[PDB]
Design a protein around this nucleic acid. Structure first.
Ligand SMILES: [Zn+2]
Lengths: 362, 98, 107, 94, 80, 81, 98, 95, 108
DNA sequence: CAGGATGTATATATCTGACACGTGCCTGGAGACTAGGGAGTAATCCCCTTGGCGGTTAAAACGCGGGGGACAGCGCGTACGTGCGTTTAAGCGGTGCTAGAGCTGTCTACGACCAATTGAGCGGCCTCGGCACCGGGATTCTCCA
DNA sequence: TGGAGAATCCCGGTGCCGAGGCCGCTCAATTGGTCGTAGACAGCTCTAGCACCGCTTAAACGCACGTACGCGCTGTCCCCCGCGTTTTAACCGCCAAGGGGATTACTCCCTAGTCTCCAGGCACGTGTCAGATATATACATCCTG
C-alpha cells in the first residue's frame, strides 16, 4: 500500500519544514564557528565542516532537537596499523615529515594520542563558542565514552549539534579496502577510479575496550562517496533529476531506514543496529540491481518486499560485507549476538504481517 | 584598434605555457649539425648514436634554464626587469666557471 | 632431507634482491671482505628510499588526474621536498620540466 | 643474447605495495634504475672510504649505518636508521 | 657553416620564458650563444675522450653520461 | 656556555671584511655574518662528530675535520692532508 | 683640526695590510668556546685536539673571506660600495646553499 | 712502537734541489706538498679505476692512466704531462 | 747470478719511487691487476707536476728576496698561474691569504 | 564600471601503441662444510687535554662630529614587445647501404705468488743560517692656497 | 700647483730556533723463478648510423608602432668612519692531574672457497586500455570607452 508510505514521507517533509528553520539557525552558528576557527591561532587552522547534504537522506538526524555535521581536518603523512583484525579499527602514526609536525604534543611516543588531541579540541571549541554570545549557545560535556562535543542552543529552543572530528587523508585508501566498493560491472571503472582517487576519513571512536590502547583507535569514514553514490543512486547518474526517471530507490531507502528506526526504538534492547546497516544493504542491492525498471515508484511496494527478501536472506547466512571493506564484515556474533539478530528477524516479520502498523501513527 | 594586448601579457602566457611543458625547445637538425661540426675538431670521421645527441640536447637545455634562473635573480637584484650581459657575466663568475 | 632454498630478501622481509647486491658488492672493489649484515641494511635503505619517492610520485601523478607516472611527476616529486631536493640538488631529469614559479615583482 | 639485468622487478613490487592501482611509463622505470645505481655507488664509495680510514679490511653494518648518517639529511637519516636496524634484527632471528 | 645562428632568437626567448624572464636586452643572444658553445666544447671534449679510449668510431650515450657525471651534473634517463 | 656568538666582535668581522676587499660596510651585516658562520660550523661539526663517534674515540682529531671538509668540496691542505 | 683623515683612507690602508698578512683574524678563546658549545648538542663529554680547532678556524676564515668576495662583487653590480644583507642572501642563493 | 710513517719529503727535496739548487723549504710547506701529491694521486687513481671498470677490463695500463690524465688536466698541462709520461715509459721499456 | 739491484725509477730516470707507488696502487682497491707501465706513467706525471709547481714557487720566493719557500709563496704561485688555478680551484691553502686585488671603482 | 573578444580548461568520441601478462629457460643465487684471518678483548703506557693563575696590553667599547653616499623624484628617449605578412627549412616518412660494433674462438705475453737480499727510508741528534725584531733614517702620501 | 705630518719600507745589528746534515737501523722493494689467465688478434654477423628524396607547414624574419623603463640629474639626510679614552680579558707561561688513544698479546667466529643444485629473472610473445587527438562548450581574464 504505497499511498500511506508516500504520505508518511510527506510527513517527514513537514518535519523538513520545521527543520529548515531549525537547521538554518544551527547551520548559521556552526558556519560562524567555521569562520572563527580559521582566524584563531592553534593547531586547528584549517578545519572545514564536511558537507554531506542537509536532507534527512544526507545527515544524521532524529527528533528535531539534535543535528549533526562532520568537521574535517587535513592530517600529514599517515600510516595505519590494523588493531581489530576484522579491519575496522586502527592505530595512527606519522611518517618522516622533514620540516616539522605541529602535532607532536598530541602523540604518546610514536602513536597519535586521540585522547589528548580530542581534549584539546574540546577545550578550544568550547572556549571559542563561549567567546561570542549572539545566540544563546553553550557546550555540554557527558562522560568521555564517545568523543563528540555537543553545543546546547537556546534559540528558539534546545538545539544540540554533536561535532564529530574526521581526519582527512589524501594518501592511498589503505590495502584493507583494496577490493571494496565493487561497482565495475554495474556503473563503470572510470567512476570507481575517480571515486577511489578521492580522500578517505578517520573518526575517533573507542572500540569496546577489550583492549589496552584506548581512544587511540579510529574507524574508517567514507561519507562523501556514500553521499555521491546515493545522490547518483541509479546506473543512470540522472536519477533524482528532471533529466531522468523517477525511481523508488530513495523512497525504498527511507521506507526501510524509517521503519527500522521506529520499530527498533520501540524495542530498545536492539540499539546496536545503526543506520550504516541499511546503507550497506542498500548499496549491495543497488549494485546487484541491473534494471532501472526494477526501481520505480509504481513498484515501491514490490521493490520494497524484494528488498525485505534481501534483508532476510542477508540475515540468514550470517554475513554482510562492509561494502567498502569486505574483509571487515560487521555481522559477527561477537558484536551482535545471534539471538538478537533472530529477535530482529521476528520483529521484522511483525512489521511485515501486520500491514505496516508503525506507519499508522501520526 | 583590433585587440592590441599590452606588452607583457603574452610574455606571461608564454611563461605559464613553458613552465608546464616538458618538450625540447630547440630544433633538432641545427643542434645535430652544430654537434658534428664541433666534434670534428677533436677527431675526424666520427659517428654519433641518436640517443647521445638527444642526451646532449637535454643536458644543454637544462643547463641554460638553470643559468637563466640566476640571471633573473641578478636582474631582480639590480632593480630591473630586463636582463643584460653584465648579469650573465656576474652569474658565471659567481658560479665559478671563470 | 634437503633444505629447499629460502631467499635472503624473504628472511629480511624485503622485495629488493639481497644476493644480487651481495655479488655487486663483492665484484666492485670496495673491500677485501663483506660482512653478512651489510646487504640487508643497504637493501632496506634502498627500498625505503624507493617507497618514499614513489608514494609522492604516485600522488603527483594522481593530482593531474593521471594513471601512469611520467617524468614530469618524478621531477615535481623531487623538487617538492626540502630534503630530497638537497639530496638531488645537482641532478638533471630528462623530460622533467621546470618548477612553476613567478617573481612577485613581475606581476 | 646479451642478457642484462636491472632493478625493475623489485621497483614494480614496491610500487604495487604503496599504490596498488598505478602504472609506470618505460622511461620512469629507467630513471628509477639510474637513481638506485647512483645511491648504491654513493653509499658503497663512502663505506669503502670509511673502512680505509679505520684500518679495516671488511665492510660491516656499522660502516653502512655511518655512511647513511653521513649522506642522508635530517629525518630521512632517522627513518633510514630505524628501518635498517629493524631489518638486521629480523634477519638475525634465523 | 656558422651554424651558431641556428640557435635562433625565438628559441632563446623560449628558454628565457621557461626561466621566468620578462624582458631581454638585444645584446643577450650572442653572449648566451658563446656560453653554450663553451659548455658544449667541454662536454664534447670529455665525451670524445671516453669514446676514443674504447677504440670506437661512434659516440654512444654512455660516454656522454660519464662525461656529464664527472662534472657534477649527473643525468637520469639515458641508460646507466 | 651561552652568548658566545657575540665573541665575534664587530671589529673582527670588520677585519675579515677588509681582508675581503670591501670598502664600506652597513651596520646590520654583522648579525647576518654570525648566522651564516653558525650554520656553516654546524654543518661541518656534525660530520666531524659523525666520523669521531664512528671511530669510537672521545677526542676529535684533525683528520676527522679534514675528511668532513673534503666531503663538502672544501679540501684543506696543511694539517696532514 | 689635528690630522683628521678622510673617510676611506684608513679603510684602504687596512685592506692593504690584511691582504698582505697570513695570520688568523679571530680570537682563539671565543672560537674554542663556540666550538665546544656547538658540539655539545650532538654528543656530550667530547674532547678536541688543538690541531682540530685550529683547522676549523682556518677553514671558517677562508670560507668567510671567499664569501665576502662574492658579496663585494654583488655590491659592485648594484652600483654601490656598501654591502647589504640582500647581497649576502643573493650570494648564498646563487652559490647553491639554499 | 715508533710507528714509522711515510711521506714524499725525500723526493720533493730531490726535485727541489734539481730544479732550484739554492732555495730551501719550510716544514709546513712540505706538509702542503704531501697533501697535494696524495690528493691528485687519489684523483687520478679513482678516475682510472672507474674507466677500467666501464670497459669490462680488470687491469690498469698506461693507456688508462694516459686518458685519465687527459681527462683531468686542462689544455697544455695535459699535453706536456702526457709527453713526459710517454717519454718515461719508452725509456723504461728499453730496460 | 743475482745481478745488482736497480730501482725501477732509476731505469725510468726519475726521482719518484716506483715501488711505493706500485704497492699503493695494489692496495688501494682500484683493480685486480696493475700493469707494469702504469706506475711509470704515474711517477712521471707526479714528478712533472711537483717540479712545475716548485719552479714558480721558487721564483715567487725570490721575487720577495727570500730564500725559503713558505705557504704564502705556494699560494702566490697557484693563484698567479692561470692553468694551476683551474686545477686547484676548489682547494684551500692553510696560511695562504689572497691575491692583492682592488676593484677599479673603489680607488680615489 | 561593463560588455566584448580572446584564451584556456573542460567535456566527449576514436584509435593506438605502450604497457601489462604469460611462457620457456638458464644462469646466478642458496645450502653445507672447511680453513684462515680479521676483529673483539684486556692490560698498560704515556701522551695530551683540561684546568688554573697572574699580569699586560692590545683590542674592544663608547662617544662624537661630519661628509658622502644612499635614496627619492622627475624627465626623456629609446629599445624592446606585439602583430602582421613572407619565406625558408625543419621534421617526417621511407629506402638503401655499409662501416663498425659486438660476439666468438685462440694463443700468448704478462701479472700474481713465493722466498731470499739488501738498501732506501725512517727516527734521532746536532748545528748553524734565515728570519724575527727593534731602531732610525728615507721616502711616499695625504691634506691646502 | 706647494709643505708638513705620518705611515711605511729598508737597512743594520742581535739573537734565536728550525732546517739541513749526520748516524743508526729495519723492513720493503728487488731478483729469480713458476704458473695461470686477461687480453690481443682474426673472423664473422648484422645493427644502425648515414645519405637521399619529397612534402608540408610551422617557424623564423623583417617591419612598423608605440610605451614603459633605464638612466641621468638634483637634492636631502642619516650613518658609518676616523679619533680619543677607558676597561677587560685573551694570551702566554706555567704547573698539575688524569683520561684515553695506542700498542701488545690473546682468542674466536665469520667469511671466502668449493661443490651441488634449482628457482627467479630475462627474453620472447600476446592482449588490451590509458592517453593523445579532435570537436564543441563554457568559463576567465584583459581591455577600452
Ligand atoms: Zn530517485
Amino acid at each position: 500500500e504505497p499511498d500511506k508510505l508516500k504520505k508518511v514521507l510527506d510527513k517527514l517533509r513537514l518535519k523538513r519544514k520545521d527543520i529548515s528553520e531549525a537547521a538554518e539557525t544551527v547551520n548559521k552558528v556552526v558556519e560562524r564557528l567555521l569562520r572563527r576557527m580559521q582566524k584563531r591561532e592553534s593547531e586547528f587552522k584549517g578545519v572545514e565542516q564536511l558537507n554531506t547534504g542537509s536532507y534527512y537522506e544526507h545527515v544524521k538526524i532524529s527528533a528535531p532537537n539534535e543535528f549533526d555535521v562532520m568537521f574535517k581536518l587535513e592530517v600529514p603523512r599517515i600510516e595505519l596499523q590494523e588493531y581489530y583484525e576484522t579491519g575496522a579499527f586502527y592505530l595512527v602514526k606519522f611518517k618522516r615529515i622533514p620540516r616539522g609536525n605541529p602535532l607532536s604534543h598530541f602523540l604518546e611516543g610514536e602513536v597519535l594520542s586521540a585522547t589528548k588531541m580530542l581534549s584539546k579540541f574540546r577545550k578550544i571549541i568550547k572556549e571559542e563558542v563561549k567567546e561570542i554570545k549572539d545566540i544563546d549557545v553553550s557546550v555540554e560535556k557527558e562522560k568521555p565514552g564517545s568523543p563528540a562535543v555537543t553545543l546546547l542552543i537556546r534559540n528558539p529552543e534546545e538545539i544540540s549539534v554533536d561535532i564529530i572530528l574526521a581526519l582527512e587523508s589524501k594518501g592511498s585508501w589503505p590495502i584493507s579496502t583494496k577490493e571494496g566498493l565493487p561497482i565495475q560491472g554495474w556503473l563503470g571503472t572510470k567512476v570507481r577510479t575517480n571515486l577511489r582517487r578521492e580522500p578517505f576519513y578517520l573518526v575517533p571512536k573507542n572500540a569496546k575496550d577489550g583492549n589496552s590502547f584506548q581512544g587511540e583507535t579510529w574507524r574508517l569514514s567514507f561519507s562523501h562517496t556514500e553521499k555521491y553514490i546515493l545522490n547518483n543512486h541509479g546506473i543512470e547518474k540522472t536519477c533524482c533529476e528532471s533529466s531522468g526517471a523517477k525511481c523508488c530507490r530513495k523512497e525504498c531507502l527511507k521506507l526501510m531506514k524509517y521503519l527500522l528506526e521506529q520499530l527498533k526504538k520501540e524495542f530498545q534492547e536492539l540499539d546496536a543496529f545503526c543506520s550504516y546497516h541499511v546503507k550497506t544493504a542498500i548499496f549491495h542491492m543497488w549494485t546487484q540491481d541491473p534494471q532501472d525498471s526494477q526501481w520505480d515508484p509504481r513498484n515501491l511496494s514490490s521493490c520494497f518486499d524484494k528488498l525485505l527478501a534481501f534483508f532476510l536472506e542477508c540475515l540468514r547466512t550470517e554475513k554482510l560485507d562492509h561494502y567498502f571493506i569486505p574483509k571487515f564484515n560487521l555481522f559477527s556474533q561477537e558484536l551482535i549476538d545471534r539471538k538478537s539478530k533472530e529477535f530482529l528477524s521476528k520483529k521484522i516479520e511483525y512489521e511485515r504481517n501486520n500491514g505496516f502498523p508503525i506507519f499508522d501513527k501520526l | 584598434k583590433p585587440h592590441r594586448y599590452r606588452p607583457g601579457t603574452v610574455a606571461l602566457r608564454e611563461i605559464r605555457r613553458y613552465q608546464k611543458s616538458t618538450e625540447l625547445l630547440i630544433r633538432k637538425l641545427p643542434f645535430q649539425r652544430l654537434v658534428r661540426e664541433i666534434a670534428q675538431d677533436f677527431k675526424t670521421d666520427l659517428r654519433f648514436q641518436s640517443s647521445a645527441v638527444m642526451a646532449l640536447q637535454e643536458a644543454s637545455e637544462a643547463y641554460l634554464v638553470g643559468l637563466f634562473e640566476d640571471t633573473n635573480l641578478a636582474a631582480i637584484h639590480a632593480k630591473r626587469v630586463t636582463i643584460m650581459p653584465k648579469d650573465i657575466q656576474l652569474a658565471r663568475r659567481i658560479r665559478g666557471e671563470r | 632431507a634437503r633444505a629447499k632454498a629460502k631467499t635472503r630478501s624473504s628472511r629480511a622481509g624485503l622485495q629488493f634482491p639481497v644476493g644480487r647486491v651481495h655479488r655487486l658488492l663483492r665484484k666492485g672493489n670496495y673491500a677485501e671482505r663483506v660482512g653478512a649484515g651489510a646487504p640487508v641494511y643497504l637493501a632496506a635503505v634502498l627500498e625505503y628510499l624507493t617507497a618514499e619517492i614513489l608514494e609522492l610520485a604516485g600522488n603527483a601523478a594522481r593530482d593531474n588526474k593521471k594513471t601512469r607516472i611520467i617524468p614530469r611527476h618524478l621531477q615535481l616529486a623531487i623538487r617538492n621536498d626540502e630534503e630530497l631536493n638537497k639530496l638531488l640538488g645537482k641532478v638533471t631529469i630528462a623530460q622533467g620540466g621546470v618548477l612553476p614559479n613567478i617573481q612577485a615583482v613581475l606581476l | 643474447r646479451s642478457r642484462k639485468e636491472s632493478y625493475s622487478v623489485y621497483v614494480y613490487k614496491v610500487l604495487k605495495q604503496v599504490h596498488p592501482d598505478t602504472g609506470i611509463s618505460s622511461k620512469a622505470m629507467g630513471i628509477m634504475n639510474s637513481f638506485v645505481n647512483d645511491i648504491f655507488e654513493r653509499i658503497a664509495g663512502e663505506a669503502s672510504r670509511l673502512a680505509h680510514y679505520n684500518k679495516r679490511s671488511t665492510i660491516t653494518s656499522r660502516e653502512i649505518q655511518t655512511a647513511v648518517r653521513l649522506l642522508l639529511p635530517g629525518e630521512l637519516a632517522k627513518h633510514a636508521v630505524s628501518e635498517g636496524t629493524k631489518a638486521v634484527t629480523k634477519y638475525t632471528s634465523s | 657553416r656558422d651554424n651558431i645562428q641556428g640557435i635562433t632568437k625565438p628559441a632563446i626567448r623560449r628558454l628565457a620564458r621557461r626561466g621566468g624572464v620578462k624582458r631581454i636586452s638585444g645584446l643577450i643572444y650572442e653572449e648566451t650563444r658563446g656560453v653554450l658553445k663553451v659548455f658544449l666544447e667541454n662536454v664534447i671534449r670529455d665525451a670524445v675522450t671516453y669514446t676514443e679510449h674504447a677504440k670506437r668510431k661512434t659516440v654512444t650515450a654512455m660516454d656522454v653520461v660519464y662525461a656529464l657525471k664527472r662534472q657534477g651534473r649527473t643525468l637520469y634517463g639515458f641508460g646507466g
